[PDB]
């Protein structure tokens, strides 16, 4: 059972917090027809860059699953690259009662964050619209309270992140 959107589920707009505007950015992959995000800000010296999901309700359930799929251009395929050029997102989670999640919030470090894992394209892709996607599924234990946030980092390649599909048995 379903938690946040299948994928096309967005109706329009995803509305996703992005930390540092200048990081990610709704690209309309309409395709079926939908929202996607992305970063490829190489070339552009210190980068952290977040996305925050919306508030997903936990319903019920302990052990949620995020898949995912996502573009990522290598960093050698990249002209110039520098040595700062990274091609691995990290996600993770954040749980609370109610809302309460602010621009400001939520601290935007690995603190109030728990990090479920880092990820990186697994050599087994499939076409899609028509680039090669990559599908890879985390799922993060306890999680107790009665929702939570989901967050993506970057800092330093480009890679877009198709769809995120949050889910539990």
Known sequence: EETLMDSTTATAELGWMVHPPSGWEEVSGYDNTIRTYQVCNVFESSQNNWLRTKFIRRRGAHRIHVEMKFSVRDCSSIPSVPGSCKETFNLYY??????????????????????????????????????????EVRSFGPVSRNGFYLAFQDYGGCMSLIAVRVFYR
């Open 94 to 135: 954040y749980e609370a009662d109610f809302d309460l999640a602010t621009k400001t919030f939520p601290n935007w470090m690995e603190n109030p964050w728990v990090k479920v894992d880092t990820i990186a394209a697994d050599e087994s892709f499939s076409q899609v619209d028509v680039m090669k996607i990559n599908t």
